């Protein structure tokens, strides 16, 4: 599993993911948006885990309106996922204290946890 970007750097994370994704087809990939506080999205932060099935890609909690330009970064990100043909979007709810260590767990544990906790979501709520 790869980890790109850095926390609280929305545009750096967005550009790093733009470069790293390339021409990868996301028709069978699963996009996990990791966040806290289900209800309040105005101050929410977001991390991303991209489970392609053959390899996974991690981006730390650097998206969302919680950071300057992070809202537009999340919108562009989800828009690009949809453009690349991603259909399966999920929203994972972790505790604020978890969110940091969860990206420091080993890949298999982190991915099993995310797949267990993820909720099917309308990507439109991030557009």
């Amino acid at each position: 599993m790869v980890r790109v970007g850095m926390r609280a750097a929305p545009r750096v994370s967005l550009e790093a993911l733009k470069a790293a994704l390339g021409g990868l087809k996301l028709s069978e990939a699963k996009v996990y948006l990791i966040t806290d506080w289900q209800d309040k999205r105005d101050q929410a932060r977001y991390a991303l885990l991209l489970h392609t099935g053959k390899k996974d890609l991690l981006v730390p909690d650097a998206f969302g309106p919680a950071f300057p330009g992070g809202e537009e970064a999340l919108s562009e990100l989800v828009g690009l996922l949809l453009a690349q043909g991603a259909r399966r979007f999920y929203e994972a709810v972790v505790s604020p204290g978890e969110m940091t260590a969860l990206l420091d767990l080993p890949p298999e544990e982190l991915l099993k946890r995310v797949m267990a906790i993820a909720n099917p979501t309308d990507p439109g709520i991030y557009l």
């Binding site: 289900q38 267990a116 099917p120 979501t121 439109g124």
Partner: protein
């Protein structure tokens, strides 16, 4: 044209829609049976305008998600909602629908607002049929523009009017 752009016409059409609210039940669990009780001959949601009940989704404005929404049912309910006419509203009935409820696990969606734009929430396990009527009057006066939250804000008539569907 969405019921807008004239002071009298929009209030009139909102009146019309509010009283003509057409429920389409999406029964999942025991919340669905407690909603079936909201139609019997003790307390009927058959007076305000909800007498008729068209199983088709092309024919109703109100989508009432009644029960626990399993993650395997989420895309089905998603597409049933997308396959509705556009002036449409969403009620989330019961704890399992509103939040994860007492079933906090891999199987159940922890907020139906994740998949569908929810208009009204109604707690309870099950929520009483009269609480559901309170919710539909709540939605009624919401589409009348008579609804406010605890913060003082007026609420838009139609949620799912604010989302980039795709």
């Amino acid at each position: 044209r969405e019921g807008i752009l004239f002071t009298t016409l929009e209030k009139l059409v909102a009146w019309g829609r509010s009283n003509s609210l057409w429920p389409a039940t999406f029964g999942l669990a025991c919340c669905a049976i407690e909603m079936m009780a909201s139609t019997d001959a003790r307390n009927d949601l058959a007076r305000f305008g909800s007498e008729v009940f068209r199983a088709s989704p092309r024919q109703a404005d109100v989508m009432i998600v009644a029960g626990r929404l399993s993650k395997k049912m989420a895309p089905v309910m998603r597409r049933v909602w997308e396959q509705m006419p556009d002036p449409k509203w969403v009620i989330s009935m019961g704890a399992c629908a509103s939040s994860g409820g007492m079933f906090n696990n891999y199987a159940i969606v922890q907020n139906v607002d994740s998949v569908v734009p929810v208009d009204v929430y109604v707690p309870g396990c099950p929520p009483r049929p009269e609480a559901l009527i309170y919710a539909v009057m709540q939605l009624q006066k919401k589409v009348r523009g008579q609804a406010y939250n605890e913060r003082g804000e007026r609420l838009p008539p139609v949620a799912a009017w604010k989302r980039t569907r795709g």
